[PDB]
Amino acid sequence: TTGERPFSDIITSVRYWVIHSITIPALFIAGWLFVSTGLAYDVFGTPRPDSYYAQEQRSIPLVTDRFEAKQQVETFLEQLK
Amino acid sequence: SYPIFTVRWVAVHTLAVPTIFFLGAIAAMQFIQR
């Protein structure tokens, strides 16, 4: 052994489950809402199903300039009106 | 007789916390419609 309490002990303790029957669902719900609120989309810049193309466009908004790449992506985004 | 907040505790939670959050997210994703 190396001093820490056995996991067998911890995960079968009543206290562990009093704590984690709160903390685990809380997290799960936090992640759930992170998606369902739409926040994920905006944090990582990921297209929603209606934001990949404008209505009649069919050209991928591929980044083509290294240093003004950012302004390129911003332009691609504005192009969705 | 036993400590609660060890190095092991830390490691375990740095992995476990984000995992449960992520699985909540992915769960949510299963009901996204185009």
Binding site: I19, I22, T23, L27, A30, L33, F34, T37 | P3, I4
Partner: peptide, 30 residues
């Protein structure tokens, strides 16, 4: 942004809860 509070309210309530429950043993340890 309201969605950050809505989403990370579960997390901070979990942490607050467990802090409340583990506080005496944590103080005893520290």
């Amino acid at each position: 942004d309201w969605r950050v509070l809505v989403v990370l309210l579960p997390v901070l309530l979990a942490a607050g809860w467990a802090v409340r429950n583990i506080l005496p043993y944590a103080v005893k340890q520290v």
